[PDB]
Amino acid sequence: YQLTSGYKPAPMDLSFIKLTPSQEAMVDKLAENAHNVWARDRIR
Questions:
Q1: What are phi and psi of 19, to 5 degrees?
Q2: Residue 6 zone, left/alpha/beta (φ > 0; ψ -120 to 50; rest)
Q3: Cα–Cα distance between 36 and 21 in angstroms, integer?
């Protein structure tokens, strides 16, 4: 828990579950595609 500037979020158990490698490596397609749609503008 790090200090804030006026607004501290603590709604749930965010430190509960660390996820599988079928999910943490799934962002490597999302950071491929959502970067590719950023690369669809970087062409021009």
A1: -95, 175
A2: left
A3: 23
